[PDB]
Amino acid sequence: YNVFPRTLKWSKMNLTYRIVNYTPDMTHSEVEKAFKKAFKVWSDVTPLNFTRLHDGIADIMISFGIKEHGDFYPFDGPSGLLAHAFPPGPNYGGDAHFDDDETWTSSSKGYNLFLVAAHEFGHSLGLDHSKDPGALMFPIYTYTHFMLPDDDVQGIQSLYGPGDED
Ligand SMILES: COc1cccc(CNC(=O)c2nc3ccccc3c(=O)[nH]2)c1
Ligand SMILES: [Ca+2]
Ligand SMILES: [Ca+2]
Ligand code: NA
Ligand SMILES: [Zn+2]
Ligand SMILES: [Zn+2]
Numbered sequence: 001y002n003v004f005p006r007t008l009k010w011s012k013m014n015l016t017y018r019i020v021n022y023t024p025d026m027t028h029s030e031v032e033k034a035f036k037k038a039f040k041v042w043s044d045v046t047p048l049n050f051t052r053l054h055d056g057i058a059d060i061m062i063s064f065g066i067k068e069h070g071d072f073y074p075f076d077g078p079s080g081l082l083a084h085a086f087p088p089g090p091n092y093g094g095d096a097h098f099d100d101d102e103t104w105t106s107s108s109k110g111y112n113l114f115l116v117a118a119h120e121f122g123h124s125l126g127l128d129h130s131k132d133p134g135a136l137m138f139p140i141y142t143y144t145h146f147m148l149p150d151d152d153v154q155g156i157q158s159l160y161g162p163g164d165e166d
Contacts, residue, residue, distance in 0.1 A: 008087045009126045009159045010059070010094070013047045018058035025104040026113060034106060035062060038117035041136070041146070042125060045153050047163030060085075060124050061092075062117075064100040075099040082141060083116050085123035096120040108143050116141065122152065126159045 005011065017039065022031050032052075039050040050060075068074045071092060073084050078101045085096035096117065103110030115136075122137045130137040135151040 007126060007159060010088045014049045016051050016053050016058035017060035017062055018053045020061055020063040023064045023100050023104045026106060030106050034114040035117050037114050038121050041118045041148050042121055042156055045148060046156055046160040048160055059094045061095040064098045066101050069097060077101045082111055083120050085120040088126050094124040096124055112143060127155050
């Protein structure tokens, strides 16, 4: 017999993701780089492995959309809502949607795709928001070498463990 896990987490360490489509704002390579770095923020401090799929069903389906894009969380045009991701689970669970009415960048301009993705993937992995205004999982986007704040380390490790500590 099995009771449901105490916290929403992935019950496997091996997770897949798929960049279903791409923003106009950045090259394919820039987007892939951003997401790759955003996943590594989490795999570096846990035992989580992330494999990119080019096609098929992945645990974390990543896409760029505007307004109504197939969930109960329609985007709202420029500014306001930026992105959202769903907590671990089947189907839309783990999926991350980015508002392509935002300007996504690999700089301090518009919204940094990597930074928002790293945050979003926190949600995909079971983290909600933090009260720590320094934390990656803080509810409000601000822009600053990236280092995962200790609050986010503690949160994610409470879910998945530290993985290899060295
Ligand atoms: C969709 O809402 C979002 C989206 C993304 C981020 C946040 C909140 N965290 C930050 O803004 C942030 N965390 C950091 C953590 C460590 C270093 C720098 C930073 C930094 O420069 N910013 C909310
Ligand atoms: Ca928006
Ligand atoms: Ca999913
Ligand atoms: Na855009
Ligand atoms: Zn959505
Ligand atoms: Zn959030």
